Write a protein that binds this ligand. Structure first.
Ligand SMILES: CCC(CC)O[C@H]1[C@H](NC(C)=O)[C@@H](N)C=C(C(=O)O)[C@H]1NC(C)=O
Ligand SMILES: CCC(CC)O[C@H]1[C@H](NC(C)=O)[C@@H](N)C=C(C(=O)O)[C@H]1NC(C)=O
Ligand SMILES: CCC(CC)O[C@H]1[C@H](NC(C)=O)[C@@H](N)C=C(C(=O)O)[C@H]1NC(C)=O
Ligand SMILES: CCC(CC)O[C@H]1[C@H](NC(C)=O)[C@@H](N)C=C(C(=O)O)[C@H]1NC(C)=O
Ligand SMILES: *[C@@H]1O[C@H](CO)[C@@H](O)[C@H](O)[C@H]1NC(C)=O
Ligand SMILES: *[C@@H]1O[C@H](CO)[C@@H](O)[C@H](O)[C@H]1NC(C)=O
Ligand SMILES: *[C@@H]1O[C@H](CO)[C@@H](O)[C@H](O)[C@H]1NC(C)=O
Ligand SMILES: *[C@@H]1O[C@H](CO)[C@@H](O)[C@H](O)[C@H]1NC(C)=O
Ligand SMILES: [Ca+2]
Ligand SMILES: [Ca+2]
Ligand SMILES: [Ca+2]
Ligand SMILES: [Ca+2]
Lengths: 369, 369, 369, 369
């Protein structure tokens, strides 16, 4: 049965540890892939960790956009190894989600001026999208959002240090049935974290051009969209300035470059996942700002520590658990964090929102390099 | 279908070898986890070995309460390897059981003053329990007991060398529906081995404070509890004095510290699993005392050898096979023994009670260190 | 349910990347088989990569027609390893297909003067064919074609540098129900790539004797056959001359030896997969010739690059995805390419025909030898 | 559904290769168990290779009746590795079969004077048999035979160089319902290969005492037994004299010691599997003697080579494929051969009887030691 996607996110007061793979620590001895850009997506049975291999193992001489890059997947918490990974697609940029029946896998491969997204429904190639700007066609590196048998994603074509072109897709059974281009001047969308919420999709993305806060786009199933920036003075991107008065436009200070991130909108509130360090991808914390989606101030109410400030962090993205998997009446918000080491490789930790008691700690990668 | 849990333990005269993994012997060459505190729990289909990894492999430079510790599981008798282990939870103290529908996993992680138990039902986080004494919240390191769709566990918070606080939980579908604190002055409960028996639960635990006999707590589904010590002069803990006249207050002699153990109450009798050595965790034997639950004498009738006195042993715990798995009219009592080597790592052997003919032997770990 | 096989190939304008295993790159560190002659076949659930192991691993002292050669299989895109490969048959020449119910595996083993094909239906030996010329009995090294519960293959017995004997088989549930010998003087058929197309089978094969174009044989379910050569001046075999005027007979120039290949007939058109280099097995491209099946000219309309001319290629073969797997109204044409390295070992890439937008690139093996 | 076991063996004219694992060749690099005494048994879905591990891997310093010995199993043709083996029982002598519902596993462990057979039905301990002579209780090292939900085996207790005691068991759902002791003076039964045939069981065994021909015992489901020797002058055991006039008392010449073997009775005929060498366990051949079960002469009609005389062979045993697995009207006879290398370890090859065309060859282990 298709995931309905019509329930709301239920409110959460903290984040509870869900998975940790210990990939690099195991890969010091075992045969473990060199992976980058991991993300989590859940079927109505299980959650799976998706990752981009380089086609190489840790502690080997074979260890950005190469033809050897493939999207693979393992059960959540298991180490990514060639003996337990399932192949998904050839991809140096990827997205994947489950509509309640089968997996949809989106894999981008090809040259920088001619990249093509290959869409797979239950392992069968069902559609392709070619690059429309011929400057690095790229996608979420996180799970697409599925509402009522339609899955949705955001793709970006154009420069990563300037104005690019952003497209929203509706995908039914692996087939593109509607695409719209976002008219967003002075905005910049990269590597969006998208989640379903009451038949709507909300994406929170990376402004690599000139934004140290995070842009967002929300749209309905007919892809009528709204855009804006997260107005909180608690800035989400990395690099970023120290916390100050925010704005609902792109904040210029330390706005160049960035990191893939996420946020969860709760009315006017927002749960913000961000690095602890404002200069490097070090540490991770979750911050509850009861007015941060629209209000410019730098006052919050809850801060939970995820990764210690002296430990390496990286990409972070959102994923959801639908009521068809949990049996609840709401959609549970969850997120993953990539812990980048170094070769360059990464492990992953994942958290889910709960209303019960939580604690902060540091769950770092822990490999002795 | 939920496990009923209303049949009684059937009487057994001996213990028959069920599984042996040979973990360290294999891990000299293969990629095998460094594991500690293994335990066994059975679904209506199969039995599974649960274990705490350190996130490290044998014969590697990465080899108590760390954020890298995770609860994992393998089919019984198989070596714990990253290529065949299923991830369960992040945990440096754990418990797990199957109510007949899905697995319930309890995983404790966090700091010593702020640890939180994360409860998972079919891989979904369903509840959390925060520490109420802020001194190392800890649990069974063995299977919880499930009666009629409710699973039960005992948790301890407080000092391990003095009076602590002990709580009994009732858990339905991963949700705590009733918890009670045990009023047990001069008692000390650690790492309880709990089993169902005629709709009631019996736990036999470790007195780390001052007790060389083993404390016990029994309770019904509404958590009305009774407490006591095992009165037999055949003492169960390790370290322990030589066998003498017992009591069922806590026996002070060699009472400090201890080892996780188990016992099976049969009316007034008791099957006692214990180390052969009274000073170290060496050897293992099963002793049938027909009056040992209530009587203070040191006379028994059956002794079966499990591990030889010159071989290393360790933690031991109980698990059961419900009639829904065996097709019998009784609940079969079974137990595992951890064989600790050294890094510090452990293999496991497991036995099940039968009324047919048995033999004693030594089934040690066998790795040449 | 049996695959009907009665729909036609749907027209395609390009080829989209489907799988890439990165076998040798992984096998530099992991335990990966030394494999040769891989091919792909799909069940109504999944596609599988079949391969001939030498019974040896990469980077080992143990690394054509040996008794240690076995046919094995893995899920598509996964590395061929002894820990995830399924054993299929003992074979130094093989074919395999799925009729919609069970796998049919054909495995040839034995001496050069006495080889016997062993037919297996769902792992059970169901029939054998002995050699009728006693000079290396051999088969497709690609998937057999199944129409309406009957699977079809072509076998060759006799010299590979001269006139041999070619037989077409009809196989129902692993049992040979009809075989016919092809009366084909001056023709030479080796390692045929066969596909179903509207209840009929079309095979495109290798002329190792005197042909640099590719011979073909088409037949109905009663094995009434037609034969010919692909008339296009775009020659398909390797070694081959430079493109010139073709012929519907065997083209003598550079006609000796060859490589296993494929083609897809579309009325009078043909999709030709071939090496880029005319002298060695280097590179790969797909060429659309709208009249190439019957017309002798060297003019085409579409050329898509698959493997770069400086990268090693090898055997190529065809496979299909039936409507019972894709849910479409047509049979999707697909092909694989073996990338040969060096020991001698090979990885594999695979493509499927689509009518959407595609790009050319190079997806080579990538191992640093 | 239970296997009926009431059809007859259908006549076969040759033996076709079924599986070959290439264990030692792979284990030079990969993590492959050191195994001994492999055997094959088939469920109504699949066939499985059962083997006794030493709890040690090839190419490791950890590499007869030890407590570390365990019965494990893999799918047929796959290498025995800790990452794909299923644990079955603790055992230094074993037997296993499938009654059509679940696996029955028999595992003998314990000391030489106190060994106990542990019977497991679907992984649950269901019965035990203790040693009745206290001199190495031992069993088939091959598959038990199941007829109509009852599985049958032969066990031996007593000296291996003299008169011992032999018992036939009937086992229903893992429970012994009838055992009978064979009154067999001057006979010696070791490591019987038993097969069902028209609701009756026939076992062909090893005379380690004074017999170079092979003893046999046949019995119905009520264990009314008949005994004898194979009267053919084609002797089956190894060591053995050169072929001469036989008898069906025990043939004294070279009668001491032996090797586990098998034979298939076809009325008065017999298919004899035996080593080529009369002094060592070298080579293997299958010999059809149309009167060899009862007639003393040394004339046969068919000889098929299995393993070359310069290659190592070892234990050989029989297994069957029931009509519920093949869909045929008869029970297909099949056999395996262990190829012993050296540590001491072994690979396995397996053959099934067919009435189609076969060839002889050598399929040796092939590891370069
Ligand atoms: C700005 C997004 C994007 C623009 C192309 O770059 C991504 C890159 N994505 C791709 C498709 O290569 C990803 N592999 C990881 C990155 C990273 O670690 O920051 C980014 N790299 C740089 C140099 O910013
Ligand atoms: C007394 C129980 C408990 C009190 C905290 O200590 C456990 C410990 N449990 C935890 C939660 O760390 C466990 N890993 C193993 C132990 C062991 O091998 O004896 C114990 N260690 C010591 C120093 O006694
Ligand atoms: C001409 C086909 C065939 C004739 C016997 O030879 C095949 C060979 N097939 C067999 C059955 O051995 C295959 N392993 C690979 C080949 C290759 O890489 O070209 C061929 N080898 C040579 C020397 O041409
Ligand atoms: C005669 C059967 C039996 C009598 C005890 O001995 C078996 C042995 N079986 C057991 C139970 O150990 C088996 N592992 C392999 C043997 C072998 O390779 O020949 C035999 N060994 C010797 C010394 O003959
Ligand atoms: C979502 O829709 C389903 C039917 O599609 C309905 O049963 C359910 O109540 C809806 N839930 C909410 C929260 O609106
Ligand atoms: C346990 O309860 C079930 C119903 O829940 C009943 O059928 C069964 O007989 C009971 N068993 C015992 C041993 O009391
Ligand atoms: C193929 O046969 C089936 C019957 O199984 C029929 O329904 C189908 O329409 C046929 N295909 C075409 C293209 O007509
Ligand atoms: C075997 O038994 C089944 C029923 O158990 C019966 O249908 C079948 O005819 C029997 N076969 C023979 C050959 O007796
Ligand atoms: Ca930025
Ligand atoms: Ca104590
Ligand atoms: Ca040629
Ligand atoms: Ca003998």
């Amino acid at each position: 049965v298709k995931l309905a996607g019509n329930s709301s996110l239920c409110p959460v007061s903290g984040w509870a540890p869900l998975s940790k793979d210990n990939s690099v620590r195991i890969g010091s001895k075992g045969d473990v892939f060199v992976i980058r850009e991991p993300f989590i997506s859940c079927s109505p049975l299980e959650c799976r960790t998706f990752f981009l291999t380089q086609g190489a193992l840790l502690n080997d001489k074979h260890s950005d956009r190469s033809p050897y890059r493939t999207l693979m997947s393992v059960p959540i918490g298991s180490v990514p190894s060639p003996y337990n990974a399932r192949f998904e697609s050839i991809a140096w940029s990827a997205s994947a989600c489950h509509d309640g029946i089968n997996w949809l896998t989106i894999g981008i491969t090809g040259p920088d001026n001619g990249a093509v997204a290959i869409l797979k429904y239950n392992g069968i190639i069902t559609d392709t999208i070619k690059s429309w700007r011929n400057n690095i066609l790229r996608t979420q590196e996180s799970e697409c959002a599925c509402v009522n048998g339609s899955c949705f994603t955001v793709m970006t074509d154009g420069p990563s240090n300037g104005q690019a072109s952003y497209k929203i897709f509706r995908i039914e059974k692996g087939k593109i049935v509607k695409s719209v281009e976002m008219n967003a001047p002075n905005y910049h969308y990269e590597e969006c974290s998208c989640y379903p919420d009451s038949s709507e999709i909300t994406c929170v993305c990376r402004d690599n051009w000139h934004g140290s806060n995070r842009p967002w786009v929300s749209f309905n199933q007919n892809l009528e969209y709204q855009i804006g920036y997260i107005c909180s003075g608690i800035f989400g991107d990395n690099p970023r300035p120290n916390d100050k008065t925010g704005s609902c436009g792109p904040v210029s200070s330390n706005g160049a470059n960035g990191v893939k991130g996420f946020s969860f909108k709760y009315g006017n509130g927002v749960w913000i996942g961000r690095t602890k360090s404002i200069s490097s991808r070090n540490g991770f914390e979750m911050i509850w700002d009861p007015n941060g989606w629209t209000g410019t101030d730098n006052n919050f109410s809850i801060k939970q520590d995820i990764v210690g400030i002296n430990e390496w962090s990286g990409y972070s993205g959102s994923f959801v658990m639908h009521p068809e998997l949990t049996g609840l009446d709401c959609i549970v918000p969850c997120f993953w964090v990539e812990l980048i080491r170094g070769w360059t490789s990464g492990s992953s930790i994942s958290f889910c929102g709960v209303n019960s008691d939580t604690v902060g700690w540091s769950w770092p990668d822990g490999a002795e390099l």
